[PDB]
Design a binder for this molecule. Structure first.
Ligand SMILES: *[C@H]1CC(=O)N(C2CC(C)(C)N(O)C(C)(C)C2)C1=O
Ligand SMILES: CC1(C)CC(N2C(=O)CCC2=O)CC(C)(C)N1O
Length: 366
């Protein structure tokens, strides 16, 4: 007879609580928003015992494991509701063909650049080396980004043909892995050449690239919407744009989708679906939440069009439309560790590109 919702503390839960007051107005049903610690850890525990919230908000990737254990109710928005959101967003909340959540927001890396050092951002990765030599002439470098984590290097590695797992029907073929193809090989090779030609240092991490961009020492960086508040502070005159192409192919960053799922154990599923489809996933619902804490790019086409007047948000969506939805399956854990190792190894000379990737491919499909 009520609704309890769980959302992370770093989100606009005050705005969500406001959509809830509006719901309670035309229904009498009280909505309760909470943001417990490590709720994504707590969820699986309480839900397994038929407890927890009616609805949970989290990035889509985690939903795969939840769905596996039957913790989420199957959703059935009709065609009409479905057409209100970007098609690609529905792919993120499919677990073996079944729709298990509603897409809310979209996140993807973008190319961030210093408008004072660089008039126009490069359109290509191939032109970075040359640009770096011109900038070096003035004591500045072209680009610095986190080389340590595959989340950051994947856009380049995947550009010309790499992929984690072949997807073709709301289902992932776990024996169709794309880390050892020519595509990925072309990409990693380009990256390695950057480091050995000294256009990039193999030890650049998150902190180092971030400080460098914020100190105006480097012209570009690769980062996500969470990094914007830090740049603002810095007082750098920055722009956010589409990532560069490689071999004429778009960079393919992984896409994370903020999702809302219904507890399979809830007695209030009809209430949940009504709250979600008719209160929250409306221009006014996203707006009340966004006002509290920005969502970034959103899945609802109508509101995204309003938000896209901010070129940083437009760029985020563009990159996301060209990226790779992050697989929600358990085998993804193998991919993280394997590809992490392959890149650090190829980068440090410890192994060749051909070797490093052949190995990773092996450990994933193992
Ligand atoms: C209180 C707040 C919180 O997040 N937890 C969890 C979180 C982590 C991920 C550390 N966890 O695994 C357990 C041990 C389940 C505790 C709290 O207990
Ligand atoms: C002060 C500076 C430039 C950054 C620092 N750092 C971060 O900035 C974030 C996390 C961290 O450890 C670590 C090192 C030793 C590289 N140094 O020197």
């Amino acid at each position: 007879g009520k609704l309890v919702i769980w959302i992370n503390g770093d989100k606009g839960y005050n705005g969500l609580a406001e959509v809830g007051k509006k719901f309670e107005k035309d229904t009498g049903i009280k909505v309760t928003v909470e943001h417990p610690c490590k709720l994504e850890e707590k969820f699986p525990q309480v839900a397994a015992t038929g407890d927890g919230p009616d609805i949970i908000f989290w990035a889509h990737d985690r939903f795969g494991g939840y769905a596996q254990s039957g913790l989420l109710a199957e959703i059935t928005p009709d065609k009409a509701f479905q057409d209100k959101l970007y098609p690609f967003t529905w792919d993120a909340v499919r677990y073996n063909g079944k729709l298990i959540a509603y897409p809310i927001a979209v996140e993807a890396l973008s190319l961030i650049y210093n408008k004072d050092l660089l008039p126009n951002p490069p359109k290509t990765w191939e032109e970075i080396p040359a640009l770096d030599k011109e900038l070096k002439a003035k004591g500045k470098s072209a680009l610095m980004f986190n080389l340590q984590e595959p989340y950051f290097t994947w856009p380049l590695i995947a550009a010309d043909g790499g992929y984690a797992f072949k997807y073709e029907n709301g289902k992932y073929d776990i024996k169709d892995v794309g880390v050892d193809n020519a595509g990925a090989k072309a990409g990693l090779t380009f990256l390695v050449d950057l480091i050995k030609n000294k256009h990039m240092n193999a030890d650049t991490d998150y902190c180092i690239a971030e400080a460098a961009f914020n100190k105006g020492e480097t012209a570009m960086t690769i980062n996500g919407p969470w990094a914007w508040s830090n740049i603002d502070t810095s007082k750098v005159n920055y722009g956010v744009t589409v990532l560069p192409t490689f071999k004429g192919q778009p960079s393919k960053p992984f896409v994370g989708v903020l999702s809302a799922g219904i507890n399979a154990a809830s007695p209030n599923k009809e209430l949940a679906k009504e709250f979600l489809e008719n209160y929250l996933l409306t221009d006014e619902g996203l707006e009340a939440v966004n006002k509290d804490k920005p969502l970034g790019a959103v899945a609802l086409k109508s509101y995204e069009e309003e938000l896209a007047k901010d070129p940083r948000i437009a760029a985020t969506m563009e990159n996301a439309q060209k990226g790779e939805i992050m697989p929600n399956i358990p085998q993804m854990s193998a991919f993280w560790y394997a590809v992490r190792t392959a890149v650090i190894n190829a980068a440090s000379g410890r192994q060749t590109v051909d070797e490093a990737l052949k190995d990773a491919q092996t450990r994933i499909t193992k």
